[PDB]
Each structure stands twice: as structure tokens, then as C-alpha cells.
Amino acid sequence: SVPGTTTDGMDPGVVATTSVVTAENSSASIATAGIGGPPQQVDQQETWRTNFYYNDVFTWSVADAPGSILYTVQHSPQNNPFTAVLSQMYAGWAGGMQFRFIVAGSGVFGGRLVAAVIPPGIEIGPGLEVRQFPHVVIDARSLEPVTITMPDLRPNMYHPTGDPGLVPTLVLSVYNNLINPFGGSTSAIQVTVETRPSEDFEFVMIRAPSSKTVDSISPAGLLTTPVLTGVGNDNRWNGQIVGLQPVPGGFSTCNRHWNLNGSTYGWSSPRFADIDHRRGSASYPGNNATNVLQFWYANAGSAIDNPISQVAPDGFPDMSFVPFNGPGIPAAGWVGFGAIWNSNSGAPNVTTVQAYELGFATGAPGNLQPTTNTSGSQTVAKSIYAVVTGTAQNPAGLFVMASGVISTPSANAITYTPQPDRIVTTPGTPAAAPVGKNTPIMFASVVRRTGDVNATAGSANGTQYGTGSQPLPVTIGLSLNNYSSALMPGQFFVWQLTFASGFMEIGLSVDGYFYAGTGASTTLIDLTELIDVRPVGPRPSKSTLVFNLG
């Protein structure tokens, strides 16, 4: 006898068929994937083919209404961890994949789940009625696993590895409300999804692995475990990422931000080199030239140095200029050490070296006001400390070092200084907006300031944070590879961030912005107990990313 309480790795449990799984589909799938040649990696006795391996886990609570979606997977060789390795030596794939669900509940629970394979060409999200497709209904009291097969319903004769085309989507939604007849704090059970290729899965043509690599067919390898723990910086301050900042209002970052199409709207390369502009006018107030505040300005659009955009010099911060006058230190400003140099010889001036506040403004000879649009604006520098003399040369130049620190009027730290009310954006960049319970996030790094240059993380004076839209390895890999055929609009590419106590998901839209499903919470995420990052793949944007840190 074999009890139902212990299940083998190769045991499928009960096999739950659906009208979408037909012999005609299987025979047509084999017969027309044969245009790739003989099927490859089809040995039935291989260990990667015979066992089920983990794909996901999800929670089913009593508050989950009938029709609400709990699980959604897209047909891919990236669901299985071993067909994802084998796809790096083959140029195509076809066939189906089995999905084994193990429900972890007792015999006292009620409520049921429903499972349908959704054909390609149908939008996946809320309002998709899973119970009016051909479906299967699973109890909460299932002891044995329930494996359903996802066939290859494809309009192409095989899926190329780079662009697969249209694929089905397996949806597990709530059929009936899960009930606990006991009543109390214990109202949730868990369902584990595992996966294994079907008997008619195959790869079709071989190809050299030095062709389109793992970094060009999916953005799974961009956001790996050392990137988010201690190695990757951000794309604004070049500082070690120590957290995530949820932005419930939404923001819009243009500079050093790459979308999933391999394009940018900014004026900066994916690197932190210096800001060097030629022929911008420099000036200094009054008639006396001792301890004066050096000023520099140049119209946006006349920076003919960058092969990416003519708006601003490379590495210029996309922050509005905060106005200040006299010997008063401004609040929340990008300042960076630099100098004024004569354009005719390239020689920097001896005495005009200071920490210059860099930003975007509107009227440089008159009243200095901040701005966000680059149109009709100008890139404006002005030193925050005293400079002896000052170059009043009109064709003069400005050279400012790459990384920047925070201007703070006192020793005490302030909030994260690129707030969305002052981030400079060209006309045309799309904005990150909260979709469902998923709010956009930034990537906080500890950035020191001009009030305490000894201030580190956890300083008793107060810790200072600067935020970026993307990690630098993420936007470095996004500029080098194109992932248009990896995510439709209205979809996220989700990773899982396992922590020491909890676990929580982030997702990347086609715009390039990252999202965590935290709702309206503004509390910074610690990112210190982060142990593991793994990808799970394309998911709907209107499906809440999980977030529990307790």
C-alpha cells in the first residue's frame, strides 16, 4: 500500500483533464514541430524529465472572493528550471508542460479552487471568468496532488527561443470561498505549484550557445542576488543599494533610465563619469570679487557634446535647482565638486573650485526659479561656499565630478532628496503610476551630505538616503539588450526576494520602472536580510505582488 500522505517526486497524483487537452492537438503539435528536424532532448528516462520541480507557492485566504485569481503562469520553457538551461543550446521549442498542485489543508476546511487553460489572444487579469472556460475544480481537502497538463496551443509551427509568439496561460482562480468553521487568526492555506515537461515537449534545432545568450532572451539575469545586496549601485547617486523606497504617488525618472525596448529619454550613458560642458555663460554678483558665489548657466538644448541627446551634458542630475542666496546652505540639493574652466585652452581656474549645486532652472540673469520640464529651461550651476574671484567669461565651461552628495542646511539628515515633485523630465517620458495594489519603488542608497561627511548608515545624527529608478547593473544590461519580445504591455517581469523572516516580490514593467505591491505604505524596506533572488517570469500588472516581511 502507498498512503496518500507521502508523494513521490515523479508522482503526478490525480491527472485532471480539460477539453483543451486533445489527441488532435498533440498529434498536430508533433507533426508540425517536425519542421525543425528530429526532436531533441526527448529521452523519457532522464531525471530532469521525470521529476516535478518547484515553480511557485501562493496563499489562499478566506477573504479571497469567488473569481479572484490566485495563480497565473505563462507557457514557457522558463517555468521548469531544466528546460531553461536546455534552451541556451537550442533555437526553438514546442510541446506542453504539466503543472502539479499540492494543496496544504486539513479535512476541516471548505472552499474550492478552479483551474483553466486560457487560449492565446485573451487578456489575462481581473474580470477574466475562469469558471466559464473548460475547467477543473479542486477541493481544499485534497490530499493527493492534482496535475493538469497545459497543451501547446500555438499559431506558429514552433516557438523560436528568442521570440516564442502567442502562448496559452494557466489560471488558478477561486471557485468557492475558503472557509474555516473555527473562526480566528488562522485563515489561510498554501498551494505549491511544481512543473515537469509533457511527453510531447521538445527542442527542434541546435544552435551555438555563443549566439543570442541568456541575457538577450529574457531579463531574468539582470536582477540577481549580489545586485540587490551589496554590489549594485543606483542610477542617480552611484551608491550601494541598501533599500527600496515605495512611492505611492508615482514618479517619472528620465535620466539614466532605460526601458525594456533598449531606449532612453535621458541625457546620460549608463555610467557615472563627469559633467563637462563647453560654452555656457558664467557670472558672479556685485563688483567685489572675494568670497563671492560663483554662478554658471547654459541653455538646455545647446549641449552639442552627447551622442544620445542635446538637452544636457552627460551625467547632469535630473533634479530641479533649489534657489538660495548668501551664506545659507540649501535643503535637498545635488551638489558636486567642480571648477570653471576657460574654453579656449581647457585650463581650469585655480581659485574657482568649490562644491557646486547643480540643477535645472528657468531664469538665470533674473530670478532663479526651479523647473521640471527641460523645454525652455537651462542647466544651472552655483557654488554653495565662498569662491575667490570668478570667471565672467561668456563662452566659459563647467567641469563637475561624477558622483554627488546632499546639501543639508544643518547636521541633521532629511528625507530622500529626489522627491517626485522635483525630478527633471523631458517631454515624452512615461510616468510610473500605481496599478492595483502595486506601487512604484525606487532604490535607496546611503548618500552622505555636507552636514556630516562622517555620516554612514545607522548614524546617531541621522541616516541620509538618495534614490534611483533602477540599479546600475539593471540599466547597464537594459541598454545592451532588447527585450521587446519578452513582456507585453500590461505585464510585469517578477522576481522573488526571499528574506530571513519574510519574502516579497518586485516586478519590472516595459517602461523600466520597478513595482512592489505594498499599497499606500511609504516605509523603506530594509534589504539587509535579503538572502536570495530568483525570477518567476511574466505576470499580469493587475495582480498584486506578494509582500509579507513578518
Added chain:
Amino acid sequence: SVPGTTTDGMDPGVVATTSVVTAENSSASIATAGIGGPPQQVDQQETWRTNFYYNDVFTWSVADAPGSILYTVQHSPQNNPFTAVLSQMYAGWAGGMQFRFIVAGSGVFGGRLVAAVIPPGIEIGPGLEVRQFPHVVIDARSLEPVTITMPDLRPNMYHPTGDPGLVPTLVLSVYNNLINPFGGSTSAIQVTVETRPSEDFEFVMIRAPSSKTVDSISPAGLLTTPVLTGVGNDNRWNGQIVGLQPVPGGFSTCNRHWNLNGSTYGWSSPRFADIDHRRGSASYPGNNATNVLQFWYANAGSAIDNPISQVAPDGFPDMSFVPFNGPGIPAAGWVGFGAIWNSNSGAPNVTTVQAYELGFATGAPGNLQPTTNTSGSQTVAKSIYAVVTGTAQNPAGLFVMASGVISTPSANAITYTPQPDRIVTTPGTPAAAPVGKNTPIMFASVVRRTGDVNATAGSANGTQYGTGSQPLPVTIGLSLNNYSSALMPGQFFVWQLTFASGFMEIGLSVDGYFYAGTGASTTLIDLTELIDVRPVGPRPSKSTLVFNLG
């Protein structure tokens, strides 16, 4: 007709073979291990190899997330009691070992366990995902036992007892969260692991009893019952350990601290002898050389006679200096009965023998400041009482007894000394951090005070508890042996203290520090009713130690 509620000692239950148990692995194991000669203790009728016997027990909480480690053991003869008895009687082994798990839960529980056998080359830590290996799933409502056999996968032809090399590892983690539908106080069940050798297990060479190499006998012998309720002293002072106190936040002690791998980062060999220096200057304030306070200092690095490190003389305490001036005695610190002496075959001076407080200062003899880091500092010593003479020669030195006390001005309740903000550290020290609910602990003792000679544990005011990092018999037994392969890093060697009304588990990490699962409490735990100590062994850091106290 056994009903399944009662299991025989020889009964495995349901056998669950994942993918590693194969017939030709067994054949390639048996035939290959004839390089040790004829196999020994291979009689498949002996009761030590036909019955399952107790190995370990572990607790499965409802708070253990999926993927959390519950029970991992490397392949060893030490996983069975009688194989651990015979392993000191033999010098090599090969073959598998069966693991019978018995889950103690009723039919109202839910949740699953997952068990895999990990191949020998794979590193086991935070990034290991166990559900993506060939595995088996076990329900919490398992009545009959489940037996998972780990085979002998090895690149060597056998396993030497002193250096087995690459072994497989059985890893049993949480597949699904444990659920109690009642909720309430009951939030954990227990699983008992029994063990029995496989059909192909054997020993080879005999060797003399107690004679093996690497994987030195696990450090179960350096911490026995008396250490806590009898002999056994501290690291800063020579007193009996009257209790343990948990520090929330962590600490760092690097004076008499030896790590798993035999090494020290600091001075002061583990013996309370005396403090002696030869080079260093003496000075006194005041124009009159009568009723003054002597002032000795030397720089950190003039300890030429110290053979361990140059930064301090041998026996000099790691207490930052408390700056004081006048007839008011300082608050806490390290004073000691000592004297001054001159160099060039010079005996100590008769008229100056006094209690001197020692420490590390910066900016002597002007504004004396306490010092946190050992590098870039200077050692200092000055009298707390009056002495009618002072010497001012440039070569001068101390002679201070090695046992020390704490100088308290009014001396009522006070505070345990030293605090975690008062311990000096060499550069490059490892820092103790709270992992999960486990906090570092630190051993207290009763120490006399200068204000009150009767510092007895009774009436007339509460006592002063002087605190040290690790016990001195542990340091004495661990300064010679090397335990680099005894304990796998990322876990700790846990014991089991048994009081008169409860029990508390104490873990010992690879840094030499001790961990307890008390939580966020600063309550001193009194070792008066402690009876006996029984070792448990290796347990990972994700498991929380128990705190069942009366």
C-alpha cells in the same frame, strides 16, 4: 494486523526513494569499497543494524516559512548511535543509511515537509533550493512512518573516518506552512528521526580505539555539567559563573577570544598571571611631590616582550579609560593593586604601592579621552588614592596583579560592567549580530568593589555582576585543538541545559560566541537549579532555541 498506530522497531513504514537510490549505485558502492579489505560488521541479522534507533527530534512550527530548514545532516556514521559507537572502532566506512521520520500530529493539521538528498559537491546554505532537487513530500497527517534512504554518493572509493571528503546531505525543509485551524496556543508539532544503516553499509580498517584525524571529535567534551554549577571561570575576572545575561544588539570581545579555527585576534594569552612593562613614562601633577596621583603612559606598540601581538602588554585589560580628576573616585573601571618600577636591573620602589586604574586613552597627558579602537592609541595607568612620592624617569614600568575589581563611588545597584559600548576592539574583528530571535549572551560573575569589601550575594544591597565573553576552560580546551571541519559554518553546536523546572538551549557559533533564544529581554538567568548538560549537536540558524522557563 497492525493498525498503523503502533509501529515495530524494525518497521520502516512507507519507503520514499527520490532519485538517488539506484541498484547500480549500490553495486558501485559495494564493489569499490573492497579497497579497505574485507568489510567489517556486515551481518544482516545483528540487532544494531536491523532496528531503527533514535537520532534527533525537531519542532515544526506554524511560523516556519516554506524553504526553512528543519533537519539537515551530512552523511556520517554519527547519525546512528551504534554506528557512532563502532566508528571509533574502525578507520573507514562506505554505504547508505535510512532515516525514518515519525510525525506527531493529528488529522486536523495541515502542511507539508519536503526531503531531498543533495549531491556531494553542492554547497548548502541560503541559496540552496531543495524543492528543485528530486524530492519527496510528507504530510503533517502522516500516521505511519516515512523512510528516506540517503545513498553513498562519493568521488572517493571509501570514506576515511578522519577525512571522509565529499558526502551527500539529507535536507528536510518546509514544503508548505503548518496550519492549525483552531489557532491558539498550539502552534508546533514534533518529528522524531530514527536511523538504521542500509543494506550496503560497512566499515573497513580497525585502528586503535580513539584515533582519527580531521572532523576532530565534535566539541561536546569542552562544555560539561560542572562548568555551569561548579568550577569554571570567566575571561576578564577569575570568578564563578553565576548566570548568563543576553545583550540585545550584540557585542565584540577580542582579548582572550579564540575562534573555531584555532586563532586569536589580539594579545593576552589565556592565563591570569600578571601585567609587566619596561618602557613607558611616569609623571605627576602639582609642584609638590607629596600626596599626588602618579601618571604612567606608553604608546600602543612598545610591547616588544609580548610574543602574540605588539599592541598591548600581556594581561592589560580591554577597558576604555574613564577620565576623572580630584578626590572623587571614578564610576566603574579596572583597578588593581600594583606598583611602579624602574629599568636597568632595578627593583620596585618601596614607598609607592597603590591601587591603580588602567585603560586606553588619547591625548595624554592633556585632555584624556576614552578610546574605542586599539589602533592609534596609547595605554595609560593612574592611581585612585594618595601616595606621598612620585618618580619622573623616562624608563619606567608597571607591576599590576592580573585579577581585577571595579571601583564604585556610592555602590548600591549600579550596572553590570563592562557595557557593550565600553569594550575596545582591534581592527579586523568579527562582530556578533542577532540572527532571528537568537541574541548573543555573556557570562556574569560576582566581583568585589572598592567601596564595599563585602560584595556577597545576600542581603545589604544588590551585587555587582562582572561580565565576560566566554568561559576560561572553553578557551583552555580550544586554544590547542583545531575545529575547522568539526562544525559546518552557518550553524551552531547546540547543547541542552536541564534546570529543575525547565530547559534552555544554548548554541555555539563558529565565531566563539554563544547564542540563546530569549528574545528582546535583558533578564539575568540564574544558574542555581541547573542539574545536568546533555549535548545535541549541529542545528542551523533558522531554528529558534527553546526558552521553557519556570
Added chain:
Amino acid sequence: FADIDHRRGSASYPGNNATNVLQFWYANAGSAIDNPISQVAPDGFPDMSFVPFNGPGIPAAGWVGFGAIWNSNSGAPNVTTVQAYELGFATGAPGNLQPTTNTSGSQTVAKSIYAVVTGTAQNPAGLFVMASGVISTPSANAIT
């Protein structure tokens, strides 16, 4: 490539007048108790020998990087001591500045290449220099 931040290194400036002086800073190698990797020098310090210079003469082939002197008791940088500081390793900081290659018995030495008004003479003072560095060249023309 993060910044160079050292606590308690002595700072000084020559002469008695404090206008357009060359700011100087030095700290013994081995007393940088900030790095969890080695105590020799602060994190990001260049492994280049200090090339000596004096007066208003620009040195040849030196690591220079923009920075400031800050008071250690509060962390506040000074307003006026911001310049391009040459960073290197030397042997005698109060006496004759000579280059060195071995870290043993040497010191990490900073000294600005342009004029600085006033100058902190505080012994426990600190130095904060930005991460990336540029070349010091005595003329417009490049060198090896």
C-alpha cells in the same frame, strides 16, 4: 569606487599667514580604524606614491581628487578648504616630503595643488576626498 573618508589625521598649513596657502593633511598608515578589510589606509585611497611639490607649481603624474577638510567632532566640512587635493604615500610629513612604495613606516598624505584660503591646523581633523581622480599635469600637454 566610493569616497575616501578618514578620521583623526593631523592637518597643517605653512607659515603664519592664512591666505592662498596650500592645505596639508597627513595620517600614519596603520591607524585607519574604519575598514573591515585592512587598517592600512582608508577605503578608496590611491596606491600611488606622493610626488613632492611646493609653491605655485603643478606636479607631474599625480592622483588628484576634489575634497575638503572636516572637523572630526561634528562632521561638518569647512567652507573654504575645498580644492583639488593630491593624494599619495609619503615618509616624512613635518620634515621633507619624500615618496614611498612600502606601506610600512609610511603615511597617507594629502596636499592641495591650488590655493586655499585659511587652513585647519587641528590635530584630530579629518579628510574627505571624492572617489574618482584625475591627473595632475604641469602643462596642457599630456604625459605617459
